Amino acid sequence: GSGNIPTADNQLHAAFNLKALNIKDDYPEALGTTRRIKQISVTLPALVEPYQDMRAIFRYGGNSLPAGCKAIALSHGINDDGLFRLDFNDGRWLPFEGIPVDDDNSLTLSFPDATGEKQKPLLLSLTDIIIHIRYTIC
């Protein structure tokens, strides 16, 4: 049992600072001075027992976002938004939209109930985490 995580208490938790991801080093600065996250999609290629969901929560560490925008859920684990419809025409923002690529996030990818159950061979056979981050260079 361990709160303030960056097997936590009964759940599994992931943490990254996106400054260490080198978004600024990806493309030259002469293109655009600011880069902002638009959409995050997650892909978790694990062996899933048929007709079983996957328990995963993905969350922003800091606080500069809208109210529900800072946290997203996950359903099954291959290129899945937390939504069910995916439309950029909605004036509701996407989750994790507007995030500057500098800092202020310990990249929370939570996994509730990582203990011995049907989720344990799922997260055991998860050989890698794969994310897809769409961002906007303006």
């Binding site: 007709y51 079983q52 969901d53 929560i57 809208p66 109210a67 529900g68 925008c69 946290a71 997203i72 859920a73 359903s75 099954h76 937390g82 939504l83 069910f84 509701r92 923002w93 989750p95």
Partner: protein, 97 residues
């Protein structure tokens, strides 16, 4: 006069939709006194749309993004909690009861 009774029930439908989509039945926005017989009901729609805008702003403060999770139930396993599970449980039923 008979159009006020039309639009007040629309305000009530809006309030019940607000009370259903956010579970807040204790609060109320479309309140009484919209009709006043001294004025012969003049300026009722102003007060009704005032209450509608109060409810719209209470929505936009309460409306935000939310977690969306699906869950798949294998019903053969929850019948297996009684151990009279489905593969025999539907199969042995043969009657006109």
């Amino acid at each position: 006069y008979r159009f006020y009774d039309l639009t007040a029930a629309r305000c009530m439908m809006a309030e019940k939709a607000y009370a259903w989509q956010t579970n807040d039945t204790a609060t109320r926005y479309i309140k009484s006194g919209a009709w006043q017989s001294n004025n012969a009901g003049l300026m009722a729609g102003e007060s009704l749309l005032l209450n509608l805008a109060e409810m719209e702003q209470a929505w936009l403060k309460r409306d935000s993004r939310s977690l969306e999770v699906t869950r798949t139930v294998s019903l053969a396993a929850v019948y297996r909690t009684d151990n009279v599970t489905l593969a025999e449980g539907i199969a042995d039923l043969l009657k006109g009861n």
